[PDB]
């Protein structure tokens, strides 16, 4: 039994160590996910002016096409 007593306490200790490692891992995962969400928000805030730049280019190029056609007539 004492063989199994000491083996059992060994396994219990290793299990506790495992739960402690789990806690540090999930805390790291939470920080990583929050950082990811922050980066995604900032990148979307850059995407917005990109879409508006596309629209601005489209509008201006319509205007320029009209001007060019008038120049050649």
């Amino acid at each position: 039994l004492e063989e199994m007593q000491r083996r059992a306490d060994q396994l219990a200790d290793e299990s506790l160590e495992s739960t402690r490692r789990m806690l540090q891992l999930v805390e790291e995962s939470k920080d990583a996910g929050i950082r990811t969400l922050v980066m995604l928000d900032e990148q979307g805030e850059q995407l917005d002016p990109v879409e508006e730049g596309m629209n601005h280019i489209n509008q201006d190029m319509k205007e320029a096409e009209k001007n060019l056609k008038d120049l050649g007539k």
Partner: protein
């Protein structure tokens, strides 16, 4: 008893492996998003360049039709 202790230990070890996998996935997600942030920086810079080029070009075309 020993059977219950061994079973619970193996369960905790596999749960830790699963948690390790989830952690690795969160970390890789963060890294991928940062990497893509670099490409979005380049996209925004080039689009600003093109917007300004086109504004000046259309100003010139309007001036030409004057």
């Amino acid at each position: 008893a020993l059977s219950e202790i061994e079973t619970r230990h193996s369960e905790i070890i596999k749960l830790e492996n699963s948690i390790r996998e989830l952690h690795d996935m969160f970390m890789d997600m963060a890294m991928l998003v940062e990497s893509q942030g670099e490409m979005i920086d380049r996209i925004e810079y080039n689009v600003e360049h093109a917007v300004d080029y086109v504004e000046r070009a259309v100003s010139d075309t309007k001036k030409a039709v004057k």
